[PDB]
From Swiss-Prot, chains A, B:
Single GO biological process annotation from the record: tRNA aminoacylation for protein translation
Species per Swiss-Prot/TrEMBL record: Methanosarcina mazei (strain ATCC BAA-159 / DSM 3647 / Goe1 / Go1 / JCM 11833 / OCM 88) (Methanosarcina frisia)
Subcellular location: Cytoplasm
Reactions mediated catalytically: tRNA(Pyl) + L-pyrrolysine + ATP = L-pyrrolysyl-tRNA(Pyl) + AMP + diphosphate
Protein name as it appears in the record: Pyrrolysine--tRNA ligase
Family in the record: Belongs to the class-II aminoacyl-tRNA synthetase family.
KW Aminoacyl-tRNA synthetase (keyword) present: yes
The protein's role, per its UniProt record: Catalyzes the attachment of pyrrolysine to tRNA(Pyl). Pyrrolysine is a lysine derivative encoded by the termination codon UAG.
Main localization category: cytoplasm
EC number of this enzyme: 6.1.1.26
Amino acid sequence: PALTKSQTDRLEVLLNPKDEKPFRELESELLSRRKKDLQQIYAEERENYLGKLEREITRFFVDRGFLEIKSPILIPLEYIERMGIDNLSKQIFRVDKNFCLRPMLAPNLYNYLRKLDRALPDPIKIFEIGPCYRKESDGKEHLEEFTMLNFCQMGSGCTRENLESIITDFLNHLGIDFKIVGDSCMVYGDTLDVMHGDLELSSAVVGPIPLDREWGIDKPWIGAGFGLERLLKVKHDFKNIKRAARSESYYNGISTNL
Amino acid sequence: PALTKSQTDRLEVLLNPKDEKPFRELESELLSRRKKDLQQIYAEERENYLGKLEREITRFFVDRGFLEIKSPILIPLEYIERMGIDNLSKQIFRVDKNFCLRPMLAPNLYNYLRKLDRALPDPIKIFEIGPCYRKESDGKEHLEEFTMLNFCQMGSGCTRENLESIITDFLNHLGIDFKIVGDSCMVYGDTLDVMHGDLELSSAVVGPIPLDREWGIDKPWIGAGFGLERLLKVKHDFKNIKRAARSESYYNGISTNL
Ligand SMILES: Nc1ncnc2c1ncn2[C@@H]1O[C@H](COP(=O)(O)OP(=O)(O)NP(=O)(O)O)[C@@H](O)[C@H]1O
Ligand SMILES: Nc1ncnc2c1ncn2[C@@H]1O[C@H](COP(=O)(O)OP(=O)(O)NP(=O)(O)O)[C@@H](O)[C@H]1O
Ligand SMILES: [Mg+2]
Ligand SMILES: [Mg+2]
Ligand SMILES: [Mg+2]
Ligand SMILES: [Mg+2]
């Protein structure tokens, strides 16, 4: 008669946002739908949502004058201290005695900004997309392995207005609803946070900040960091961010346990 | 008069493969050339070689009927044992008590092959591109953080001839010279190795192998794994694989220390 909590949980795994007693028939129907969804992907486009979003974001920023960076994921532990992360400090995945999995893209991008200032014309515009890692207790809006986009500009035109304009163009391009709000944190400021309801899509900063001196930066700058899995969650109306992650359990938000 | 070893080393950092006393003038010339190279990239294409190669490889395999996978980089340690890696075992970067950085894409792809067999028509064709990690003593042809491509097919048409044909089409597409040779290893076989001179570009396997049973696989299959940094090294004639890596020291093989 009434579905159990465990049965409802099983059906929820197989339910997709656009879907509109006995359990076995409900399960059979959804299994059929999800198999057909995977079959359609396989027959036609064959692209993974996370990969495809990375490619779309890459095109957006390249076309707008930003240099594509691919920097190390395993970074020196000293970069954490140098970012002012003292006792986030408890969220770091340490590897060996001298390295960690990067929890953010900032330190590598600081180094690129400094180095490229010796070669490139003002303003210097760069971005990176790639894996980042944090130990998290939360499951709904957080992953321990996620994908960040960070873009930044240094030199001329590094105004709050320009930053808000890039953010607005970017999210209107992707078709993601948002509002920009004031907030603060230990590492940076004073940030602008880009929100979708109560979900943070991005934290953005208008420099300079005193942290810059440690990285050999003495020019104005602006930048923002976005989680790609959060963008996908909002775009595809996933109830849990696990549907948007690098995963063996979901493919393009479709359960692989069929 | 004569350049010192240290001076020659400095000039070699700034020398690019296509380049054709006192040290200060030689250094000044090369600095100028390398700055202009970065300026040209920034003015025109703005793509990173590693990112661009990933995108090109993605297009090749998608167009040939392979499903794009994005699976976890941090994987359970049990996957290592289950791959038959017992005491490579000393090359694994362990994280926490239960996880490691994946040294290869095989285990995740085995799981995808098994899972997708319940949904997709025969043959099942999949590929993944992404970071892999191994502790290495060698610096010239090895990185500790590298990027793998692995493709595989399971079911019908899983012949050595078909495998060699995919490999041949792929490398002729990229414009990379190669020969396919017989070899062997502890994990798989009996492999075919794809060589560029004495450099291994890929190891390839024609299944079934007895390892399959552990992963719930009982069908014929073929697959190959390629290092993207090795492909770039060969394509761009880099003397050291560090020029092709995720790096803060090189961008598209150009020194960032200018
Ligand atoms: N654990 C995570 N899982 C998924 N996305 C994340 C995670 N941590 C950060 N992000 C994304 O990266 C962006 C910038 O990083 P940051 O501002 O450091 O995150 P944060 O303030 O810790 N987010 P939250 O923990 O929800 O308050 C965030 O706005 C998110 O979109
Ligand atoms: N440390 C590394 N750095 C760069 N590429 C690598 C590394 N290890 C493996 N690869 C690439 O991944 C491919 C398949 O992996 P695998 O066959 O396990 O490597 P391998 O036999 O250990 N190579 P080698 O150590 O040179 O004999 C290789 O053919 C390389 O192109
Ligand atoms: Mg957080
Ligand atoms: Mg924040
Ligand atoms: Mg090896
Ligand atoms: Mg090999």
